[PDB]
Amino acid sequence: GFKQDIATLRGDLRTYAQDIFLAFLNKYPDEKRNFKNYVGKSDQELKSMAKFGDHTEKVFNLMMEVADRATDCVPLASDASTLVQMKQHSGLTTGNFEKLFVALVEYMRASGQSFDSQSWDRFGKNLVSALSSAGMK
Numbered sequence: 241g242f243k244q245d246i247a248t249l250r251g252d253l254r255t256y257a258q259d260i261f262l263a264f265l266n267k268y269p270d271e272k273r274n275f276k277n278y279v280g281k282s283d284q285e286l287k288s289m290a291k292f293g294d295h296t297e298k299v300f301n302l303m304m305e306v307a308d309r310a311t312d313c314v315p316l317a318s319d320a321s322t323l324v325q326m327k328q329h330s331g332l333t334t335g336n337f338e339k340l341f342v343a344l345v346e347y348m349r350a351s352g353q354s355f356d357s358q359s360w361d362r363f364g365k366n367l368v369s370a371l372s373s374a375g376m377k
Protein backbone atom coordinates (compact mmCIF):
# COMPACT_ATOMS: atom_id res chain seq x y z
CA GLY A 241 0.00 0.00 0.00
CA PHE A 242 0.94 3.66 0.37
CA LYS A 243 3.66 3.15 3.08
CA GLN A 244 5.36 0.36 1.14
CA ASP A 245 5.23 2.60 -2.02
CA ILE A 246 7.23 5.24 -0.14
CA ALA A 247 9.89 2.52 0.61
CA THR A 248 9.79 1.37 -3.08
CA LEU A 249 10.22 4.95 -4.36
CA ARG A 250 12.99 5.72 -1.82
CA GLY A 251 14.95 2.56 -2.85
CA ASP A 252 15.52 4.05 -6.34
CA LEU A 253 14.57 7.65 -5.72
CA ARG A 254 16.93 9.45 -8.19
CA THR A 255 15.43 7.35 -11.08
CA TYR A 256 11.74 7.55 -10.01
CA ALA A 257 11.99 11.30 -9.32
CA GLN A 258 13.40 12.00 -12.83
CA ASP A 259 10.96 9.64 -14.59
CA ILE A 260 7.85 11.05 -12.82
CA PHE A 261 8.89 14.70 -13.15
CA LEU A 262 9.56 14.13 -16.91
CA ALA A 263 6.11 12.44 -17.20
CA PHE A 264 4.67 15.64 -15.62
CA LEU A 265 6.57 18.00 -17.99
CA ASN A 266 5.67 15.89 -21.08
CA LYS A 267 1.94 15.55 -20.09
CA TYR A 268 1.72 19.32 -19.36
CA PRO A 269 4.12 21.13 -21.71
CA ASP A 270 2.91 24.67 -20.61
CA GLU A 271 4.30 23.76 -17.12
CA LYS A 272 7.93 24.21 -18.50
CA ARG A 273 7.20 28.04 -18.40
CA ASN A 274 8.04 27.98 -14.61
CA PHE A 275 11.34 26.44 -15.97
CA LYS A 276 12.66 28.61 -18.85
CA ASN A 277 16.02 26.67 -18.94
CA TYR A 278 13.97 23.51 -19.73
CA VAL A 279 12.45 24.58 -23.12
CA GLY A 280 13.73 22.84 -26.31
CA LYS A 281 15.34 20.00 -24.31
CA SER A 282 14.77 16.25 -24.74
CA ASP A 283 14.45 14.13 -21.57
CA GLN A 284 18.09 12.91 -21.71
CA GLU A 285 19.24 16.56 -22.07
CA LEU A 286 17.11 17.60 -19.02
CA LYS A 287 18.68 14.72 -17.01
CA SER A 288 22.16 16.16 -17.79
CA MET A 289 21.19 19.71 -16.49
CA ALA A 290 22.31 20.27 -12.86
CA LYS A 291 19.28 22.37 -11.72
CA PHE A 292 16.89 19.70 -13.17
CA GLY A 293 18.67 16.83 -11.23
CA ASP A 294 18.72 19.04 -8.10
CA HIS A 295 15.10 20.40 -8.19
CA THR A 296 13.84 16.88 -8.97
CA GLU A 297 15.76 15.08 -6.15
CA LYS A 298 14.69 17.77 -3.59
CA VAL A 299 10.97 17.56 -4.81
CA PHE A 300 10.88 13.77 -4.23
CA ASN A 301 13.05 13.73 -1.07
CA LEU A 302 10.58 16.21 0.53
CA MET A 303 7.40 14.73 -1.08
CA MET A 304 8.35 11.30 0.43
CA GLU A 305 8.79 12.88 3.92
CA VAL A 306 5.35 14.57 3.61
CA ALA A 307 3.82 11.25 2.50
CA ASP A 308 5.63 9.43 5.41
CA ARG A 309 4.26 11.91 7.95
CA ALA A 310 0.68 11.65 6.53
CA THR A 311 -2.19 9.74 8.23
CA ASP A 312 -4.33 7.77 5.76
CA CYS A 313 -2.96 9.91 2.85
CA VAL A 314 -3.81 13.23 4.68
CA PRO A 315 -0.67 15.35 5.14
CA LEU A 316 0.21 17.34 8.25
CA ALA A 317 -1.05 20.94 8.15
CA SER A 318 2.58 21.98 9.16
CA ASP A 319 3.97 20.31 5.99
CA ALA A 320 1.41 22.23 3.85
CA SER A 321 2.33 25.54 5.60
CA THR A 322 6.09 24.85 5.00
CA LEU A 323 5.45 24.24 1.25
CA VAL A 324 3.32 27.48 0.96
CA GLN A 325 6.05 29.57 2.75
CA MET A 326 8.88 28.45 0.27
CA LYS A 327 10.15 31.63 -1.52
CA GLN A 328 11.25 29.62 -4.67
CA HIS A 329 7.50 28.65 -5.14
CA SER A 330 6.37 32.38 -5.18
CA GLY A 331 4.59 32.00 -8.56
CA LEU A 332 2.94 28.59 -8.02
CA THR A 333 -0.76 27.72 -7.55
CA THR A 334 -2.54 24.52 -6.48
CA GLY A 335 -2.97 23.70 -10.24
CA ASN A 336 0.85 23.11 -10.54
CA PHE A 337 0.72 20.49 -7.70
CA GLU A 338 -2.55 18.88 -9.04
CA LYS A 339 -0.90 18.32 -12.41
CA LEU A 340 2.26 16.74 -10.83
CA PHE A 341 0.04 14.22 -8.93
CA VAL A 342 -2.09 13.41 -12.03
CA ALA A 343 1.15 12.52 -13.88
CA LEU A 344 2.54 10.58 -10.86
CA VAL A 345 -0.68 8.49 -10.57
CA GLU A 346 -0.74 7.82 -14.41
CA TYR A 347 2.97 6.79 -14.19
CA MET A 348 2.18 4.32 -11.39
CA ARG A 349 -0.84 2.89 -13.32
CA ALA A 350 1.36 2.36 -16.43
CA SER A 351 4.21 0.72 -14.39
CA GLY A 352 4.53 -3.07 -14.17
CA GLN A 353 4.40 -2.73 -10.37
CA SER A 354 1.78 -3.04 -7.55
CA PHE A 355 1.79 0.66 -6.54
CA ASP A 356 -1.35 1.70 -4.63
CA SER A 357 -2.27 4.31 -7.30
CA GLN A 358 -5.65 5.05 -5.55
CA SER A 359 -3.82 6.15 -2.39
CA TRP A 360 -1.51 8.41 -4.32
CA ASP A 361 -4.51 10.04 -6.11
CA ARG A 362 -6.05 10.75 -2.67
CA PHE A 363 -2.66 11.96 -1.27
CA GLY A 364 -2.43 14.42 -4.23
CA LYS A 365 -5.99 15.85 -3.74
CA ASN A 366 -5.52 15.98 0.08
CA LEU A 367 -2.20 17.79 -0.33
CA VAL A 368 -3.84 20.32 -2.76
CA SER A 369 -6.65 20.90 -0.22
CA ALA A 370 -4.07 21.37 2.60
CA LEU A 371 -2.02 23.77 0.46
CA SER A 372 -5.16 25.92 -0.26
CA SER A 373 -6.06 25.97 3.50
CA ALA A 374 -2.40 27.07 4.29
CA GLY A 375 -2.66 30.02 1.80
CA MET A 376 -1.64 28.77 -1.68
CA LYS A 377 -3.60 30.51 -4.53
Ligand code: HEM
Nearest residue numbers: 271274291294295298299300302303328329332336337340
Ligand atom coordinates in the same frame (compact mmCIF):
# COMPACT_ATOMS: atom_id res chain seq x y z
C1 HEM B 1 5.93 18.38 -3.44
C2 HEM B 1 6.30 19.14 -4.51
C3 HEM B 1 7.50 20.07 -4.58
C4 HEM B 1 8.55 20.24 -3.72
C5 HEM B 1 8.71 19.40 -2.48
C6 HEM B 1 9.40 21.28 -4.22
C7 HEM B 1 10.56 21.60 -3.51
C8 HEM B 1 11.41 22.56 -3.95
C9 HEM B 1 12.57 22.93 -3.24
C10 HEM B 1 13.01 22.32 -1.91
C11 HEM B 1 13.11 23.93 -3.99
C12 HEM B 1 14.38 24.68 -3.67
C13 HEM B 1 15.61 23.81 -3.99
C14 HEM B 1 16.07 23.88 -5.44
O1 HEM B 1 15.71 24.78 -6.29
O2 HEM B 1 16.89 22.99 -5.83
C15 HEM B 1 12.27 24.16 -5.14
C16 HEM B 1 12.50 25.08 -6.10
C17 HEM B 1 11.65 25.33 -7.17
N1 HEM B 1 10.51 24.74 -7.47
FE1 HEM B 1 9.77 23.33 -6.49
N2 HEM B 1 8.88 21.80 -5.35
C18 HEM B 1 7.76 21.08 -5.64
C19 HEM B 1 6.87 21.22 -6.70
C20 HEM B 1 7.06 22.16 -7.70
C21 HEM B 1 6.22 22.29 -8.83
C22 HEM B 1 4.99 21.38 -9.07
C23 HEM B 1 6.75 23.33 -9.60
C24 HEM B 1 6.25 23.83 -10.89
C25 HEM B 1 5.35 23.17 -11.65
C26 HEM B 1 7.95 23.82 -8.92
C27 HEM B 1 8.80 24.86 -9.31
C28 HEM B 1 9.99 25.23 -8.62
C29 HEM B 1 10.92 26.28 -9.07
C30 HEM B 1 10.75 27.12 -10.29
C31 HEM B 1 11.94 26.34 -8.19
C32 HEM B 1 13.13 27.25 -8.23
C33 HEM B 1 13.88 27.24 -9.57
C34 HEM B 1 14.06 25.83 -10.12
O3 HEM B 1 13.16 24.95 -10.06
O4 HEM B 1 15.15 25.56 -10.67
N3 HEM B 1 8.13 23.04 -7.80
N4 HEM B 1 11.24 23.29 -5.10
